[PDB]
Write a protein that binds this ligand. Sequence first.
Ligand SMILES: C[C@H](CCC(=O)O)[C@H]1CC[C@H]2[C@@H]3[C@H](O)C[C@@H]4C[C@H](O)CC[C@]4(C)[C@H]3C[C@H](O)[C@]12C
Ligand SMILES: C[C@H](CCC(=O)O)[C@H]1CC[C@H]2[C@@H]3[C@H](O)C[C@@H]4C[C@H](O)CC[C@]4(C)[C@H]3C[C@H](O)[C@]12C
Ligand SMILES: C[C@H](CCC(=O)O)[C@H]1CC[C@H]2[C@@H]3[C@H](O)C[C@@H]4C[C@H](O)CC[C@]4(C)[C@H]3C[C@H](O)[C@]12C
Ligand SMILES: CC(=O)N[C@H]1[C@H]([C@H](O)[C@H](O)CO)O[C@@](O)(C(=O)O)C[C@@H]1O
Ligand SMILES: CC(=O)N[C@H]1[C@H]([C@H](O)[C@H](O)CO)O[C@@](O)(C(=O)O)C[C@@H]1O
Ligand SMILES: CC(=O)N[C@H]1[C@H]([C@H](O)[C@H](O)CO)O[C@@](O)(C(=O)O)C[C@@H]1O
Ligand SMILES: CCCCCCCCCCCCCCCC(=O)O
Ligand SMILES: CCCCCCCCCCCCCCCC(=O)O
Ligand SMILES: CCCCCCCCCCCCCCCC(=O)O
Ligand SMILES: *[C@@H]1O[C@H](CO)[C@@H](O)[C@H](O)[C@H]1NC(C)=O
Ligand SMILES: *[C@@H]1O[C@H](CO)[C@@H](O)[C@H](O)[C@H]1NC(C)=O
Ligand SMILES: *[C@H]1O[C@H](CO)[C@@H](O)[C@H](O)[C@H]1NC(C)=O
Lengths: 532, 532, 532
Amino acid sequence: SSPPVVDTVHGKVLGKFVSLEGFAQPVAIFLGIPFAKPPLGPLRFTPPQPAEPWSFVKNATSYPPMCTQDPKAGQLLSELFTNRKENIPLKLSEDCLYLNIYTPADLTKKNRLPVMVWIHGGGLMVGAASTYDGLALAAHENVVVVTIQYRLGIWGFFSTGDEHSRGNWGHLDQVAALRWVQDNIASFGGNPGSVTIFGESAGGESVSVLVLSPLAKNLFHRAISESGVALTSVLVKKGDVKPLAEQIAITAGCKTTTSAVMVHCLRQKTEEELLETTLKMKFLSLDLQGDPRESQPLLGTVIDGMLLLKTPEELQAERNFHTVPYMVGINKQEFGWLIPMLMSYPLSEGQLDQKTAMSLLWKSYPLVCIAKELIPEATEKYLGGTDDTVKKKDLFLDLIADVMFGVPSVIVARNHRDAGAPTYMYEFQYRPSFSSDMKPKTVIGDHGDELFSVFGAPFLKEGASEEEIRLSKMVMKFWANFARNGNPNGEGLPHWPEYNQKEGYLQIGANTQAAQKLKDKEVAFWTNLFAK
Amino acid sequence: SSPPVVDTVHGKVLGKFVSLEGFAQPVAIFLGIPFAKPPLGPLRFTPPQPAEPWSFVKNATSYPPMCTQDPKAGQLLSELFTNRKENIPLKLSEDCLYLNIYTPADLTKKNRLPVMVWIHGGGLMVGAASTYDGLALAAHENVVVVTIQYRLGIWGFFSTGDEHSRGNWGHLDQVAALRWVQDNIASFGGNPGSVTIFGESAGGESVSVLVLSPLAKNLFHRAISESGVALTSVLVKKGDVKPLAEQIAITAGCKTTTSAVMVHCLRQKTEEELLETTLKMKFLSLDLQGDPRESQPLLGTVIDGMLLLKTPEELQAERNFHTVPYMVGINKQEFGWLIPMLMSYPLSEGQLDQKTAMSLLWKSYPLVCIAKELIPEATEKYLGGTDDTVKKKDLFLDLIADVMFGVPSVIVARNHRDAGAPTYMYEFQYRPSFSSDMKPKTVIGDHGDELFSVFGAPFLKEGASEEEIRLSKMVMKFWANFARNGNPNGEGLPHWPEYNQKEGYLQIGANTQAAQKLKDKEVAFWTNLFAK
Amino acid sequence: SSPPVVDTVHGKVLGKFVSLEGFAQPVAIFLGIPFAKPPLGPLRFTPPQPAEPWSFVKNATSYPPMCTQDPKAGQLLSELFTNRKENIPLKLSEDCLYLNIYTPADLTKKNRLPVMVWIHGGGLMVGAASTYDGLALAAHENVVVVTIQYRLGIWGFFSTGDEHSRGNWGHLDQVAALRWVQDNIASFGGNPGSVTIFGESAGGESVSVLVLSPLAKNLFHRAISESGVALTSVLVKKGDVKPLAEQIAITAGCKTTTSAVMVHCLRQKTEEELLETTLKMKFLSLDLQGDPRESQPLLGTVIDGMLLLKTPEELQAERNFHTVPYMVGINKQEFGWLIPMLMSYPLSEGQLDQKTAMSLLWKSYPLVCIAKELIPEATEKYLGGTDDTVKKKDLFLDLIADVMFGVPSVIVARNHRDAGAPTYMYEFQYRPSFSSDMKPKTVIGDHGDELFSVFGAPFLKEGASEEEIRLSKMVMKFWANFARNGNPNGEGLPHWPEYNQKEGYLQIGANTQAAQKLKDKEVAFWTNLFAK
Ligand SMILES: C[C@H](CCC(=O)O)[C@H]1CC[C@H]2[C@@H]3[C@H](O)C[C@@H]4C[C@H](O)CC[C@]4(C)[C@H]3C[C@H](O)[C@]12C
Ligand SMILES: C[C@H](CCC(=O)O)[C@H]1CC[C@H]2[C@@H]3[C@H](O)C[C@@H]4C[C@H](O)CC[C@]4(C)[C@H]3C[C@H](O)[C@]12C
Ligand SMILES: C[C@H](CCC(=O)O)[C@H]1CC[C@H]2[C@@H]3[C@H](O)C[C@@H]4C[C@H](O)CC[C@]4(C)[C@H]3C[C@H](O)[C@]12C
Ligand SMILES: CC(=O)N[C@H]1[C@H]([C@H](O)[C@H](O)CO)O[C@@](O)(C(=O)O)C[C@@H]1O
Ligand SMILES: CC(=O)N[C@H]1[C@H]([C@H](O)[C@H](O)CO)O[C@@](O)(C(=O)O)C[C@@H]1O
Ligand SMILES: CC(=O)N[C@H]1[C@H]([C@H](O)[C@H](O)CO)O[C@@](O)(C(=O)O)C[C@@H]1O
Ligand SMILES: CCCCCCCCCCCCCCCC(=O)O
Ligand SMILES: CCCCCCCCCCCCCCCC(=O)O
Ligand SMILES: CCCCCCCCCCCCCCCC(=O)O
Ligand SMILES: *[C@@H]1O[C@H](CO)[C@@H](O)[C@H](O)[C@H]1NC(C)=O
Ligand SMILES: *[C@@H]1O[C@H](CO)[C@@H](O)[C@H](O)[C@H]1NC(C)=O
Ligand SMILES: *[C@H]1O[C@H](CO)[C@@H](O)[C@H](O)[C@H]1NC(C)=O
């Protein structure tokens, strides 16, 4: 009929209607609504500022650029995670602080449906909101889906360790996007009083960080972390970041006389110059030689003193803060294929032996952070089993997957529980049909595999079996129900126990049913080993 | 006597005294009083900001730079319009937001004479305030003459179609200069309560735009448009300007990922780089090949939503706004020689035929905007007369002159009349002795010809006959009288009827006398044709 | 037992303890506390802005950079003035607005000791705060010593003569540092109510300027000028500075179309480009050829209308302002060796004759500003004595030393006296053992020779005789006592008469005793001659 025209605080917005077959009420889709002023020029390495009001009707009908990142790695990930039919080719630009909205509400009438803000993952180095289509989830569960974006890599996490460039710019963008929702979502038939944040991987770590951040207080009422939390060391930088700053500065051809000097110099660099720098620093790829403790992984969350007053560990060790329903989950094989492949892991052989194992585990320091003195014990605890070289490789992948997501996730869940807030956990175990062709038939429940069920990929792509079509319907029910009541349960779905003392959790997959004490053994072991 | 020292809001200003022979009270001349903060750096493509106060006495005794523009074309025009003896060689700089004042009032005593603010023309691409000397008009009619400047070309009209660079910067500069007058002219013996704005060519179109703009409300009490109004299509960009922005961006060696990106990039360019971009774009010159509908003539007035809430046409279709005495006039041969000679029209042959006529009229699209399907009818209506090839060229020149000034001007005048405000029209028909040597003696009342009478050129230059010396005295009387009572009439001058229902207008020239229905036939014809 | 951690308005600061042998309570030393936001980028040529607050504990344990300047000349001076054992190699950076604090107070308890802010010298073109160690003075006299820094050369004194770059940035930095002290020193056991400012050479001239500046009112309660005041023409630019600005602009490869243009262009230059410009200008070195009245010796204090409402001379001619105890002193031979040795003065011959004398005095115009018509009289009044060519050199050096410091200092002292405020004068006459090896042993009271006694160099360096060790103890007592009661006197010290009508002053040196009418003869003579 007629293009959707909503009125926001900064001005009228124009969208387009899209009908999901099987549903009458077409969903109103807005692409590219700016939630902050383009962090260009001097605004670089500074908190996001409010957007400028527009005089007439703004057309939110074109996919917004994605924050500057490594185009190759970026598009690759966008194609592997996208839940839509065709992958949308995105553009790169520092001007990327936008968000997309998918509202199934009949805008003609006053609607206040629950809101679900999605924070995409990509190790805080790559990623885009347009990758995740909300058409299905919005219609299928009748909730407003919001996909936001935030500065990545240098642009969003460069910190000099002091006031001259605290850092966490990216995290502040996410908060900024959340404030925008509180002041506008109501015009999109969404209830600003019922906003649920959820993300995968880095997005999960972000969701976890927002949960600990005082700034995010009152900006959301429910949180979900998918394969990633604030205890996922690889994403949270501790200690003196000054050295990393200086290394970047030099790589960017800048002086390092003082923090201010560095920041000023980098603000002079062109988007393009910093993009090259990014590639030079070779992030998201595991260094094989040199000292494993010097292979900086990827700029990340720091303890700026604004967003995070102290390390996550310290923070969660307190029950004096605002608590909300939190759902933390993981997948059967987090380090199954996706991450290992991307990082260009040396596993190219097919199998692995105790000796080469302790070697890789060492070079994998920037990911697991395991002292070289502990390497032996850890290796033995996991590969000490069968003498099967091929199995050691599989047990090795479990080793990493546990230190990065398994143990961290459960630890966070427990603390959220002991804090006195509704906690829920799950373990996605299913191999989507939308997986890559280069993904072994064996790998089931790899990193990001639940993203297809969560975003109803079966209802957008083709070939999904009735089994997958059903699984998706369930997951969305759970997620949506959680967004609503802060409880996944609802008639028509298996019972999902609350992660309390019994530590009950739901095993999601072809066979969905409750269970108890997730990674309980693992958490225990690693806690001791790491306690030196 | 001792140099004039006036006290303005921002600080003391120093000028110089200049006596016009025949007048006792010497006129106080101030050159280069800044009315806004230099729109340099990030201030580019943004509204003008207030000037910084100075600590002591500022010497307004040196002609201010002229806004960056084609130096050649610029000086050429400055020499052809200047009314002073010698042409003042101007400098180019982005730092050009200044104004010159010519006050005949005895500053030693409280004086509140009428103020006349002059907006120079030049297709918004070139021009300068220093070109027009106010010494004669100020003394001869005892009124304060103010010549202002405003950003030109890219610097003053680059619009991305959205909030990232709405545009009309130039028009905002004019408004800014008007506000300055309301807060300072009183210190120059001028009455802030009686400010009359007037300009020629784009200056007229500007005066016409200020009349429709809500921002200009209460900044002036009388307006005069000389050969140019808001209905002069070549100076108003309607539709999506986004494509033009992008074309400039590229030409400037910029990316066009997003509006913000474009604007940011251009703000990085040097004044010099944007000046070259300007030469490349080749404005002011009619493209002969390619598609006539793609030859963008020059950057201009847009509907930003701040200065203009909608197209002039829509605006004038309302009688719910602030109305003031408006005087709109034209010259016998608007497209006689000046304009064509500048744009390089292929008429050097001397004559023209029906066939080549329809051709030129087509390529002249960016000026007359005549559908190729209408070209035939229009051509026939004008050249269908004598078979004289030489006369067809003239009739052809009348064709264009009517669509650009004739019909537009009358249409505006009528609406201002029907609105209920004092309206006046005229048709200057005289060939000044100060014309160019390359201008054929047959062309009478060519574009800008009245500028010599209006600015008492005969009293500054040499060789003016007693007839011209007299004509000038009259025009100034009329103009000044209008500035005073909002009515040109006054004892000692022919009767100038008010442009009411009878549509009476004054025919100015060697033979000055009233007449009726100016371009009445033309307006009617073109209205029908264009309505097809 | 633990590094000192003070809490300032902007955040916690970390320092280090250092014990001066012979004193129990170790002094807390803070190096690099920022008192203003790095004047980088667009902040260049603008007043200093407040510093950004830091989230945790800032380590003030590393010597801050020194403001960009001629590194050679800079380090040379730092080595000749330093009172510490080893000369600290400093870094150059526009990011130099820092200050160092030396507090002998036991931070564990509430202490409010007198504060002494030191303004280093270096002709407003070189210098650093780290050069002067306060450990000794702080302990020995139990007062908080603060060494500040301020923009130098172009960075701190470039003025276009108007609001587009008034100038005196450097002086504003000093004021900024003083405001910081009023809002923080109390956290360092210092009494914000008893702040004494003191400096040598340009520092003295600054102290003298701050005394005349309305902005500095209430930021200090006592002032001391060592060899340098606001009447030291060489460091006070009068007249139109526009020409100097333009000359710099060009030398920097900038246009000079307008002030704004110049300032904008220079803000584009890199720290490095402006540093080369500095070197190209050659300020230190007295020009030998060309016109002496065109050899701009500086970039200095101007009459911006903000810091100074008018020339020092005019200002001191008033008794309607805030007055405080002022101590102005000079050294026996101000132009003895140091200054002349730096400007590469052509005195290498060893002697000088009446003829060559009048020659040098002329080329020394930018220092003494003596009309070529007066050169003869002046020369005769000083060298007209013995026919000894070698003595003429000596008397010649006295000539300059009197016009630059002698007469100016006394004139200032008298006016401060006649104003009605406690005035004190002295004449340091002693040759420190810490002098340069290339310094003749016949030169006593060279420029800056008192700096070793004032900063207890004998207690940091080695070889000081008991005579020098004693002299130092005395001077510090005097200085400290003054800072305390605004009176140098105190039991255990020779009587220091107040510079009243008797014009009594103290002769400091191996033989310390009062005297009267300092440079009385000189002041008189030069006053007449200069009055033409
Ligand atoms: C795609 C191909 C299977 C052949 C087929 O399906 O016809 C399989 C066989 C061996 C596989 C490789 C080996 O298993 C060794 C590596 C194992 C890692 O988990 C992924 C990368 C890794 C380098 C694998 C890439 C890909 O999955 C390969 C190359
Ligand atoms: C500039 C040139 C004079 C020759 C020269 O200077 O060497 C003159 C001679 C022929 C002139 C042209 C012809 O007279 C035909 C046209 C007459 C119109 O009145 C002006 C445009 C018009 C297109 C003229 C432009 C310009 O004045 C021309 C081109
Ligand atoms: C350093 C040297 C003494 C040699 C030594 O001590 O072994 C002395 C002897 C001659 C001196 C120079 C001569 O006395 C001439 C000049 C005298 C001025 O007062 C200082 C600069 C001046 C140019 C002196 C510089 C320096 O003090 C010199 C060069
Ligand atoms: C830059 C561009 O050409 N794309 C489009 C952009 C983007 O959609 C928005 O910036 C959100 O991404 O703006 C419009 O949509 C709009 O507001 O009218 C028009 C334009 O077609
Ligand atoms: C150097 C230069 O070009 N500027 C001239 C200005 C101009 O009047 C303003 O730029 C406005 O035109 O006037 C001065 O006398 C002045 O402001 O004191 C300085 C100089 O003569
Ligand atoms: C490279 C540099 O100069 N910065 C050093 C600063 C300076 O010492 C202070 O800014 C005073 O100069 O101290 C730090 O420890 C700090 O403040 O956190 C960081 C770093 O060591
Ligand atoms: C075809 C090879 C391209 C090179 C691949 C570049 C590596 C991209 C890495 C993808 C980001 C996902 C990492 C997740 C880390 C985490 O947050 O746990
Ligand atoms: C590059 C060589 C210089 C050629 C001269 C270019 C011609 C400039 C003419 C200025 C246009 C002024 C007339 C206004 C016409 C209009 O209203 O559009
Ligand atoms: C190219 C210029 C940079 C060279 C550095 C300038 C050196 C100046 C000499 C040191 C300052 C001591 C002289 C005091 C000046 C005075 O107040 O008269
Ligand atoms: C904006 O979208 C509307 C609705 O489709 C359309 O009419 C208009 O042309 C669009 N404007 C732009 C910028 O293309
Ligand atoms: C600051 O210095 C102190 C010791 O002087 C030390 O405890 C601390 O680690 C330093 N902080 C940093 C991060 O440099
Ligand atoms: C104003 O200052 C200018 C530039 O310094 C100078 O030429 C002039 O003497 C001053 N005023 C006048 C015109 O006397």
